[PDB]
């Protein structure tokens, strides 16, 4: 039993809600919140820009030190950093950005990072400003993640379409 509330159950291990992931994180304070990161951990917009703003830019300061030490992530890769005021940890996961020409096949690799964590709050990888089809992202999530994932979908219209079209 966990403290996630109001989710629709899609499968044995995947749940979905129409919610602002920032507000969800502030309420639940989960062990792991997933960020829709880029390889440079530049949290300018989308989910990443919103999560960083909620940390008063502390996520960005920590991220800049991480990159200065380690260099960029791989597309499809991840790193674990602090969750600041939002969660214990933030798993920064890089899904392919279709608006940069990146291979959508890497979306499965991106979701595989979730399997290293028993429970996660997360957005749909590569959705939104990353330019991929959120319906496809949901399918890859369900077919790849085996740990317990609570998906927050900000857009109500998109949330309704994802549920109604789910197979």
Min CB(139)–ligand A1A6N separation in Å:
14
Q: Which two tokens stand for residue 2?
A: 């966990």
Q: Which two tokens stand for residue 30?
A: 């989960």
Q: Does 22 bind ligand A1A6N (CB under 6 A)?
A: yes
> Distance (Å, rounded) from C-alpha 136 to C-alpha 118?
23
Cβ–Cβ under 8 Å, residues 149 and 122: yes
Min CB(17)–ligand A1A6N separation in Å:
10
Min CB(156)–ligand A1A6N separation in Å:
11
Min CB(157)–ligand A1A6N separation in Å:
11
What does the per-residue mask of binding to ligand A1A6N show for 109-138, with x meaning CB under 6 A?
A: --------------xx--xxx----x----
Q: Does 145 bind ligand A1A6N (CB under 6 A)?
A: no
> Distance (Å, rounded) from C-alpha 38 to C-alpha 72?
9
Closest CA to 138 of 74, 95, 102, 101: 95
CB atoms under 10 Å from CB of 79, counted, come to: 18
Cβ–Cβ under 8 Å, residues 92 and 37: yes
Min CB(51)–ligand A1A6N separation in Å:
7
CB atoms under 10 Å from CB of 30, counted, come to: 23
Q: Does 30 bind ligand A1A6N (CB under 6 A)?
A: no
**Out of 4, 114, 154, 159, which residue is the one contacting ligand A1A6N (CB under 6 A)?**
154
Q: Does 21 bind ligand A1A6N (CB under 6 A)?
A: yes
CB atoms under 10 Å from CB of 58, counted, come to: 13
Q: Does 4 bind ligand A1A6N (CB under 6 A)?
A: no
Q: Contact positions toward ligand A1A6N, by CB under 6 A?
A: 20-22, 46-47, 50, 123-124, 127-129, 134, 152-155, 158
């Amino acid at each position: 039993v966990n403290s996630f509330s109001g989710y629709l159950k899609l499968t044995d291990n995947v749940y979905i809600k129409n919610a602002d992931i920032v507000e969800e994180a502030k309420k639940v304070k989960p062990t792991v919140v997933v960020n829709a990161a880029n390889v440079y951990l530049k949290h300018g917009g989308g989910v990443a820009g919103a999560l960083n703003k909620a940390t008063n830019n502390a996520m960005q300061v920590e991220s800049d030190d991480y990159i200065a030490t380690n260099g960029p992530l791989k597309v499809g890769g991840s790193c674990v950093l602090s969750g600041h005021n939002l969660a214990k940890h933030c798993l920064h996961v890089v899904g392919p950005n279709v608006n940069k020409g990146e291979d959508i096949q890497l979306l499965k690799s991106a979701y595989e990072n979730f399997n290293q964590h028993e429970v996660l709050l997360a957005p749909l990888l590569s959705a939104g400003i990353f330019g991929a089809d959120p319906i496809h992202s949901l399918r890859v999530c369900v077919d790849t993640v085996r740990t317990n994932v609570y998906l927050a979908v900000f857009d109500k219209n998109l949330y309704d379409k994802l549920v109604s079209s789910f197979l």
